[PDB]
Amino acid sequence: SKAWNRYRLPNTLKPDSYRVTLRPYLTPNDRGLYVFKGSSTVRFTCKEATDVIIIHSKKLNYTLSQGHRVVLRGVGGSQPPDIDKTELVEPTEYLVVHLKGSLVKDSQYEMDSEFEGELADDLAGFYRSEYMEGNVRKVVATTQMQAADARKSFPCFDEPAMKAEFNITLIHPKDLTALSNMLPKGPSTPLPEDPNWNVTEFHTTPKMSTYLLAFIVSEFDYVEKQASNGVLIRIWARPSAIAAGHGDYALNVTGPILNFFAGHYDTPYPLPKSDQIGLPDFNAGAMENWGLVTYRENSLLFDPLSSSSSNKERVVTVIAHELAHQWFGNLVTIEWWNDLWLNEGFASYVEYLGADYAEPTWNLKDLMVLNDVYRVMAVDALASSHPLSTPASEINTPAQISELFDAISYSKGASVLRMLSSFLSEDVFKQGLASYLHTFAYQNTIYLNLWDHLQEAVNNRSIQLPTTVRDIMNRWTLQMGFPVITVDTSTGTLSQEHFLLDPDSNVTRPSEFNYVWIVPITSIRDGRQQQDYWLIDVRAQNDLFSTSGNEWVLLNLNVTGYYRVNYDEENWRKIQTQLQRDHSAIPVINRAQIINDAFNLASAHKVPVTLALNNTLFLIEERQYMPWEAALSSLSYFKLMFDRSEVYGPMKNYLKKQVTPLFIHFRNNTNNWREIPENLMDQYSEVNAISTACSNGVPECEEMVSGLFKQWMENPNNNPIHPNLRSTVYCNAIAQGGEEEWDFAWEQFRNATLVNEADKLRAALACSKELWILNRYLSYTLNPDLIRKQDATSTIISITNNVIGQGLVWDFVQSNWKKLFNDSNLIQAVTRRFSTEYELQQLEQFKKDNEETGFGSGTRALEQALEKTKANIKWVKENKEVVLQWFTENSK
Amino acid sequence: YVDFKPQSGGGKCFNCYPAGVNITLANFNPLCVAVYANVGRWSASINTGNCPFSCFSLKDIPAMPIVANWAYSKYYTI
Ligand SMILES: *[C@@H]1O[C@H](CO)[C@@H](O[C@@H]2O[C@H](CO)[C@@H](O)[C@H](O)[C@H]2NC(C)=O)[C@H](O)[C@H]1NC(C)=O
Ligand SMILES: *[C@@H]1O[C@H](CO)[C@@H](O[C@@H]2O[C@H](CO)[C@@H](O)[C@H](O)[C@H]2NC(C)=O)[C@H](O)[C@H]1NC(C)=O
Ligand SMILES: *[C@@H]1O[C@H](CO)[C@@H](O)[C@H](O)[C@H]1NC(C)=O
Ligand SMILES: *[C@@H]1O[C@H](CO)[C@@H](O)[C@H](O)[C@H]1NC(C)=O
Ligand SMILES: *[C@@H]1O[C@H](CO)[C@@H](O)[C@H](O)[C@H]1NC(C)=O
Ligand SMILES: *[C@@H]1O[C@H](CO)[C@@H](O)[C@H](O)[C@H]1NC(C)=O
Ligand SMILES: *[C@@H]1O[C@H](CO)[C@@H](O)[C@H](O)[C@H]1NC(C)=O
Ligand SMILES: *[C@@H]1O[C@H](CO)[C@@H](O)[C@H](O)[C@H]1NC(C)=O
Ligand SMILES: [Zn+2]
């Protein structure tokens, strides 16, 4: 009940601006530690009289000044009380300054601090990244503040609604460049006390959130180009990468996308530059720091002669995402983390507008269906999901905050925005967003502000809806989950229900809306689009959905809506007949829909599993990427459930039969793999065809991949494998080979120069079928001299994905949990195979044994795994025999 | 004879004005009547100015700019 023991800051004090000086030491001290020293002044206003200053501070040591950890000064004639004492409160990560009196309402004060912290290799706060230039160790000082690590570099009121201006100074080796949010204010100058250091001050920032600050000291090089909106774009990377041209594509796309977003939203980018910088060590994909956007090398750099088309798509989409955040996140910021989707869902959606602009021939917007909608529907069909906008009172600790950086906030956000754009039209949507951005520039918002401005746009355009924007979208935003819409085509009746993968699951979160939605329903009849419909009730009837004779209907054209669709068995049969007769008559996206929906309905016991399997029969003559990907993704569950059981043989025989003609088609069309298709989707289709043929035992594929890998081994410096095929060729060649292939791939990894190639080799190495090799590799994943810490868990996940690595890794996690924790995706990946009572009991015993240690940002994930495991136990029991029989009868 | 190298070495810009420049017209003090390799995307040529054709001098006379481009996108005058 003490303010310093509560996780949210008091409302008594509010900052205006800060100055911060930071000085990193890029060589170890006597203790072997890399450190930084700094100072700060915060100017703040007292809103309510208080005798305590509560400010965030994490892993900082303070140098005493005038007898205390800080110095308190007046502003404008104020006379602050004397300081009684300070304390560091570790649980809430606060510096608490207890005063001998009360502050005065509506007066300003300044607080000065001098401090030191570790420049740790922990990828959080102010940290160090390392690379090699030849034989020379290079150490870089860099930052990652989101969500709650700005406090780890200097004391600050570290909440996104505590906006302030920042005056940054970096003290750095005279030979190294200092970068921050703004451009340098004048030239760097030698430090007077020691001319081996230069002092670089930066211009004052805009009013902004603490989580967007960035401080980087390095000797990176860069390329640069002024964008057509006058913004300076720079691409920064290790000197060898810049000289090799690996930043050129980012320079090609960054400025044009930025100008596109500024025009599209009628809202200028206000800063003089937008730096893009690629770090050798970085936890997430990137971070949208205002003026200094950081990236993994694998999300920013690109080599046209060795990087894949998938790598290029990742680069352009990640750049588009980070640039989208300049509007949705930086200029306008969430009031609190509970509304995180307002940043990430928009960025997750708007990235497609930007990337499609940069690469208009790729048709990326379509991929939103697979990569976002169906990605998130998996977890959002669980009882342990969470609403798009969680109640603010539930999100308090850093762990709860970092838990929300999940599939809901990113992908459901994007899906719901896709749906909103579809039923409003994108033009009306962006008009309303422009109004939102103009009104709330440099301020903070909640979801209701968005609804109000979208309603203003709807009214301006005279769009007619069944009710207000607020009442429609609250259904999609304030309660979890999504509906399945069930159509009875005999009568044209529709109904909706909350879609749950397990009917037996225990939904404990109440909804004031009773898990009923207002649903925009599009539809086609025999390939012709029908009038749009609004489903407002639990059930309704409309002749739009009644059929007679040979007619079929489909709902959710191009899957613009965030819902699943079921039909009566007769309509399903008509659809299957259409797929056999002429599958091109159904839009490709709706074919993906038919497959994914049918498989999920089967999991939920709403359709027979044989119906979903029958929906895959036509794939033997499907050449499009998207329906195959939807099938393979759905069948991934079958693989996880059955790849340690008698069903796997028959399953592989079936996939082999279904994929062989496509494989032969690509073999011919590619001139025996000499070329790749022009169209991106066809390139992805080719890669999936190869991966499927090899994974399921097509002898021509095994021969092709082993031959190509051997040819590379015979000419290591002349890689003959097209980048698009390298991931699958490496994995299957390692699986087909032995110690010699593995050691070759490992040596290629250690000496690698491009991070894309390293990533592919590192994933491929987990495909060894030899347990001893997997164990040795597991031992390598934990040594930062061998595998960068940023990649440790990813590599462990690759190992757990190998059927032979499942038990190895699960046992490792049980044996090493304490060490792992004290030194989320891993739990999800390691547990998804679980389908036995034994494994469930192991998971529960693991929970019991580690309840005190806790699971941090993986807590929810453990609950979800338990739910899935229980469902998996039941699903296998119900389906294992029937599925075996189906595969047996269909694999011939 | 002309030679130049792209800026690099740390903190420098690879696609900006070249670091090293050497425009040496032999027999100059106004004289009267390519060394740089393909270092990346960098190329260079001579361009016309006020004179119609494609007494010479590097100093001002009471001209022809030497252009150096990067990927045919960023151009720089010497
Ligand atoms: C950060 O820098 C700005 C710019 O100098 C400071 O704002 C100035 O503050 C003084 C003192 O009140 C005023 O007289 C100036 O007019 C202000 N200038 C501008 C452009 O606003 C700001 O105080 C600095 N913040 C800190 C914490 O030092
Ligand atoms: C639904 O998706 C399909 C496929 O993405 C769209 O069809 C494309 O439309 C564009 C625009 O005219 C054409 O250039 C393409 O050639 C079409 N693709 C095919 C395979 O024919 C369709 O327009 C989308 N419709 C809606 C309402 O979203
Ligand atoms: C901060 O103080 C603690 C305890 O005295 C010490 O262990 C740690 O090394 C210090 N950190 C720095 C960067 O000096
Ligand atoms: C540091 O300052 C000195 C002072 O002249 C200057 O020569 C040097 O170029 C500066 N370093 C950087 C990286 O700007
Ligand atoms: C991007 O690079 C390509 C070269 O492949 C060039 O044609 C194009 O003009 C560049 N984009 C811009 C905006 O200059
Ligand atoms: C599960 O449901 C029962 C009643 O159906 C309820 O008492 C219980 O609280 C639910 N589970 C949780 C964790 O609340
Ligand atoms: C579709 O599944 C049904 C059982 O649900 C089965 O009788 C039928 O044979 C399957 N379709 C084909 C073409 O075999
Ligand atoms: C290169 O420049 C230097 C001075 O910068 C000069 O002494 C030398 O003669 C030049 N060399 C050539 C080949 O022009
Ligand atoms: Zn983001």
Side-chain angles (χ1 to χ4, degrees):
Chain A
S1 66
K2 305 304 186 166
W4 52 87
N5 296 327
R6 299 202 290 269
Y7 281 89
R8 297 298 309 271
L9 285 173
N11 61 17
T12 57
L13 301 185
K14 181 165 174 53
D16 297 294
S17 67
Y18 298 78
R19 51 182 182 273
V20 182
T21 295
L22 288 176
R23 186 180 177 175
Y25 291 89
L26 297 175
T27 56
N29 61 25
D30 47 288
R31 307 192 193 278
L33 298 165
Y34 293 93
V35 302
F36 64 99
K37 288 166 184 192
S39 64
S40 188
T41 293
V42 53
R43 174 180 287 205
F44 57 98
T45 299
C46 177
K47 309 301 293 186
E48 179 195 349
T50 183
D51 63 349
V52 68
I53 298 172
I54 295 171
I55 196 168
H56 290 113
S57 187
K58 190 185 176 170
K59 302 290 180 171
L60 294 170
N61 292 353
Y62 289 83
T63 300
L64 292 177
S65 185
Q66 297 173 31
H68 308 283
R69 281 195 178 95
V70 299
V71 180
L72 180 60
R73 293 183 173 181
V75 177
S78 74
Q79 295 295 339
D82 287 346
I83 296 162
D84 180 23
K85 60 195 183 188
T86 66
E87 301 171 349
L88 294 170
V89 177
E90 288 171 316
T92 48
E93 298 300 346
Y94 292 142
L95 167 67
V96 180
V97 187
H98 298 104
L99 307 172
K100 284 177 182 200
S102 295
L103 301 169
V104 182
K105 187 185 158 183
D106 311 322
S107 304
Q108 288 183 305
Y109 305 91
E110 284 178 358
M111 179 175 80
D112 307 322
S113 55
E114 296 166 335
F115 48 83
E116 174 175 12
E118 184 186 359
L119 199 74
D121 64 356
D122 66 356
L123 313 177
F126 199 20
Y127 74 88
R128 70 171 187 277
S129 173
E130 289 181 27
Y131 61 104
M132 295 300 288
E133 214 174 62
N135 296 123
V136 180
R137 167 62 74 202
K138 306 294 187 172
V139 184
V140 168
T142 188
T143 49
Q144 172 62 33
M145 311 309 198
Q146 192 184 51
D149 280 308
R151 62 187 74 167
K152 195 184 172 271
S153 72
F154 68 96
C156 54
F157 300 91
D158 192 14
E159 294 188 348
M162 307 272 192
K163 293 197 173 185
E165 297 83 39
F166 297 91
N167 299 341
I168 301 304
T169 293
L170 297 176
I171 299 172
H172 52 103
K174 68 173 179 195
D175 47 300
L176 301 180
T177 298
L179 295 171
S180 194
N181 301 82
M182 309 306 287
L183 284 172
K185 178 177 189 186
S188 75
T189 64
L191 184 71
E193 36 163 307
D194 183 350
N196 286 330
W197 299 70
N198 270 17
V199 177
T200 303
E201 182 176 20
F202 295 89
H203 283 283
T204 305
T205 67
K207 188 177 179 173
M208 67 181 270
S209 303
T210 51
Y211 80 84
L212 289 167
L213 287 164
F215 317 127
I216 305 176
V217 175
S218 75
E219 54 170 49
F220 284 5
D221 289 336
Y222 68 85
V223 287
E224 81 183 340
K225 192 166 157 187
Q226 182 173 286
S228 65
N229 61 350
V231 179
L232 179 64
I233 307 299
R234 304 177 173 191
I235 313 300
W236 292 81
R238 297 172 290 95
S240 316
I242 296 301
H246 300 342
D248 293 0
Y249 182 61
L251 193 65
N252 199 254
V253 301
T254 299
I257 294 164
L258 187 75
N259 181 71
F260 165 76
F261 287 152
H264 189 77
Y265 295 111
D266 190 35
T267 303
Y269 177 83
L271 277 201
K273 55 141 173 177
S274 179
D275 280 329
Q276 319 303 309
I277 188 160
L279 280 307
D281 298 279
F282 197 81
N283 178 56
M287 176 63 212
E288 66 262 29
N289 319 288
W290 208 357
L292 185 49
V293 182
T294 49
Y295 295 74
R296 287 173 169 255
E297 289 182 312
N298 77 11
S299 303
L300 183 65
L301 300 175
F302 176 75
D303 177 359
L305 300 174
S306 65
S307 297
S308 66
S309 289
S310 182
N311 295 151
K312 200 176 191 171
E313 194 216 319
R314 177 173 171 79
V315 170
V316 68
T317 58
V318 173
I319 290 169
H321 180 108
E322 300 309 314
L323 296 182
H325 276 306
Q326 308 307 294
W327 290 262
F328 304 103
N330 297 9
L331 184 73
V332 176
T333 308
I334 51 167
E335 174 69 26
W336 182 240
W337 304 105
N338 67 302
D339 254 340
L340 180 61
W341 78 280
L342 291 173
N343 286 12
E344 295 307 339
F346 276 91
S348 293
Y349 178 60
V350 169
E351 80 182 39
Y352 293 99
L353 280 45
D356 175 80
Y357 174 79
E359 298 286 357
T361 67
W362 291 5
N363 301 315
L364 299 185
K365 287 188 196 182
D366 287 354
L367 300 173
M368 207 181 308
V369 179
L370 295 171
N371 299 353
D372 298 294
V373 187
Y374 297 147
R375 192 171 189 177
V376 68
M377 280 185 168
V379 67
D380 204 31
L382 303 175
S384 47
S385 184
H386 69 82
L388 203 45
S389 184
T390 299
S393 66
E394 294 183 33
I395 303 301
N396 293 296
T397 69
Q400 286 164 346
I401 291 164
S402 195
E403 215 299 322
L404 296 179
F405 288 77
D406 68 358
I408 300 296
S409 299
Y410 282 73
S411 286
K412 180 175 179 172
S415 305
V416 167
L417 298 173
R418 173 193 174 70
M419 179 172 57
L420 187 47
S421 185
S422 175
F423 80 75
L424 293 182
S425 81
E426 201 278 333
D427 205 66
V428 172
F429 192 36
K430 72 167 184 192
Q431 177 181 337
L433 300 172
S435 171
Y436 174 79
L437 294 166
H438 296 158
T439 296
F440 291 106
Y442 310 99
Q443 298 177 5
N444 299 80
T445 52
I446 62 168
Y447 63 99
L448 293 180
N449 298 134
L450 173 63
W451 307 150
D452 286 344
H453 290 268
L454 300 186
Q455 189 69 57
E456 284 176 37
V458 162
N459 293 353
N460 281 9
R461 194 62 206 122
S462 298
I463 306 305
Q464 297 300 335
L465 297 171
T467 185
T468 60
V469 173
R470 168 185 300 218
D471 283 1
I472 295 160
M473 298 309 296
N474 279 354
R475 304 298 182 88
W476 299 101
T477 304
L478 302 179
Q479 66 194 342
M480 73 179 78
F482 55 86
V484 46
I485 307 303
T486 303
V487 183
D488 186 345
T489 58
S490 280
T491 57
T493 64
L494 296 194
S495 52
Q496 54 165 301
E497 166 179 2
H498 181 10
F499 180 78
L500 292 163
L501 279 164
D502 189 350
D504 304 335
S505 61
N506 192 10
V507 178
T508 59
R509 184 184 290 269
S511 172
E512 299 176 358
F513 305 119
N514 302 298
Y515 294 105
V516 179
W517 289 267
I518 298 162
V519 190
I521 302 192
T522 59
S523 66
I524 52 175
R525 175 186 300 263
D526 289 346
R528 312 169 190 271
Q529 185 169 9
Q530 307 190 113
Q531 284 212 301
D532 295 342
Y533 179 79
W534 281 97
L535 178 64
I536 63 178
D537 274 342
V538 161
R539 65 183 56 84
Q541 188 287 329
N542 196 283
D543 293 352
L544 285 164
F545 314 116
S546 185
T547 58
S548 59
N550 285 333
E551 288 176 333
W552 50 262
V553 290
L554 285 179
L555 273 55
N556 206 358
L557 172 58
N558 285 344
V559 189
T560 55
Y562 189 66
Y563 60 88
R564 294 195 178 283
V565 183
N566 197 11
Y567 308 98
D568 59 280
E569 56 167 21
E570 196 185 356
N571 197 66
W572 274 122
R573 279 194 301 93
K574 296 184 197 177
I575 292 167
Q576 291 167 343
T577 295
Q578 186 67 63
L579 289 165
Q580 186 189 40
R581 289 177 58 80
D582 183 0
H583 65 269
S584 89
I586 296 164
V588 300
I589 293 167
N590 292 95
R591 310 213 282 273
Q593 177 209 38
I594 284 155
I595 296 167
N596 191 281
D597 279 0
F599 274 112
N600 281 269
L601 293 161
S603 280
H605 217 279
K606 293 166 193 301
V607 300
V609 73
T610 55
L611 189 157
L613 293 160
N614 281 350
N615 288 349
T616 67
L617 191 65
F618 85 99
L619 289 173
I620 198 151
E621 55 161 303
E622 175 69 82
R623 298 183 171 166
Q624 289 281 348
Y625 168 64
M626 192 185 311
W628 266 102
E629 181 52 29
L632 292 165
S633 175
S634 290
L635 286 167
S636 177
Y637 179 66
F638 280 59
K639 178 177 159 49
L640 295 165
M641 290 304 97
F642 295 129
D643 68 1
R644 301 170 300 167
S645 83
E646 64 179 348
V647 178
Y648 201 45
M651 178 174 172
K652 290 198 288 171
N653 296 339
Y654 176 68
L655 291 169
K656 174 175 178 300
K657 170 178 168 179
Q658 294 300 92
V659 84
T660 290
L662 185 64
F663 174 82
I664 297 300
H665 159 74
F666 281 121
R667 187 183 64 178
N668 182 287
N669 169 63
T670 59
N671 191 20
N672 301 330
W673 323 110
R674 283 175 183 93
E675 316 170 321
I676 51 134
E678 182 194 320
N679 176 267
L680 187 62
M681 293 305 95
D682 293 339
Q683 293 176 37
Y684 293 171
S685 184
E686 182 198 2
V687 174
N688 266 346
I690 296 166
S691 171
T692 305
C694 272
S695 288
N696 295 286
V698 173
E700 292 91 336
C701 192
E702 318 294 340
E703 292 159 10
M704 184 267 284
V705 305
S706 65
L708 276 176
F709 198 85
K710 181 174 178 175
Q711 179 182 346
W712 184 32
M713 283 180 73
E714 294 171 348
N715 306 273
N717 293 39
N718 295 279
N719 193 329
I721 307 150
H722 189 283
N724 282 12
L725 271 53
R726 291 178 184 192
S727 289
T728 192
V729 169
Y730 297 173
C731 170
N732 286 289
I734 284 168
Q736 294 287 296
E739 295 89 329
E740 183 175 341
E741 292 73 16
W742 200 96
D743 290 346
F744 174 76
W746 177 243
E747 295 307 336
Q748 292 297 138
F749 171 75
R750 296 280 313 282
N751 84 339
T753 70
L754 174 60
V755 185
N756 290 129
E757 181 76 9
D759 284 344
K760 295 180 185 70
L761 289 159
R762 185 169 49 79
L765 291 157
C767 303
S768 174
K769 297 175 178 179
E770 293 179 74
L771 186 46
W772 79 267
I773 290 176
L774 294 179
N775 264 86
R776 185 174 67 179
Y777 194 35
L778 186 59
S779 78
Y780 298 169
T781 70
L782 307 163
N783 184 343
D785 295 335
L786 298 181
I787 286 171
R788 289 176 180 274
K789 291 174 75 171
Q790 60 166 33
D791 298 321
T793 64
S794 164
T795 308
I796 296 163
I797 286 168
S798 293
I799 298 170
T800 206
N801 295 345
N802 184 325
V803 66
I804 302 301
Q806 175 65 35
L808 168 61
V809 177
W810 177 227
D811 294 350
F812 167 78
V813 165
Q814 288 168 293
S815 295
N816 293 276
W817 186 257
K818 180 150 148 36
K819 296 195 300 312
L820 285 182
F821 192 81
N822 298 265
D823 161 28
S824 191
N825 284 348
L826 182 55
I827 293 175
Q828 180 173 253
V830 78
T831 58
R832 54 188 169 215
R833 275 201 177 81
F834 293 174
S835 64
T836 63
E837 188 61 29
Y838 179 76
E839 285 161 308
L840 176 62
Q841 290 174 13
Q842 292 182 311
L843 188 56
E844 295 171 336
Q845 195 63 55
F846 170 79
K847 179 172 174 177
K848 272 161 197 124
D849 290 351
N850 297 288
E851 264 161 2
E852 289 168 18
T853 292
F855 300 96
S857 61
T859 302
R860 296 291 182 181
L862 175 61
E863 287 317 296
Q864 295 182 341
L866 288 155
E867 177 180 344
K868 284 186 271 196
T869 299
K870 297 172 194 172
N872 292 342
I873 294 163
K874 296 178 292 198
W875 189 85
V876 169
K877 178 184 184 174
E878 167 92 348
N879 288 281
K880 63 181 172 69
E881 288 313 307
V882 55
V883 171
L884 169 64
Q885 176 189 41
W886 195 97
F887 280 137
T888 296
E889 293 177 339
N890 287 273
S891 60
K892 294 171 173 172
Chain B
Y1 304 83
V2 176
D3 194 15
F4 72 95
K5 285 190 173 183
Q7 264 194 139
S8 60
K12 297 296 183 181
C13 166
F14 182 76
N15 76 321
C16 302
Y17 187 96
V21 185
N22 227 357
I23 297 175
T24 53
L25 168 54
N27 305 339
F28 185 88
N29 190 268
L31 180 60
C32 284
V33 180
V35 190
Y36 57 97
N38 299 20
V39 191
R41 305 269 279 279
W42 272 93
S43 178
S45 298
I46 57 168
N47 187 61
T48 182
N50 188 27
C51 301
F53 302 105
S54 181
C55 283
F56 302 110
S57 178
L58 276 48
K59 299 181 183 303
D60 303 335
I61 278 176
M64 300 187 194
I66 289 165
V67 300
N69 63 22
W70 180 77
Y72 302 155
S73 173
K74 287 210 69 170
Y75 296 73
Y76 277 90
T77 47
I78 314 299

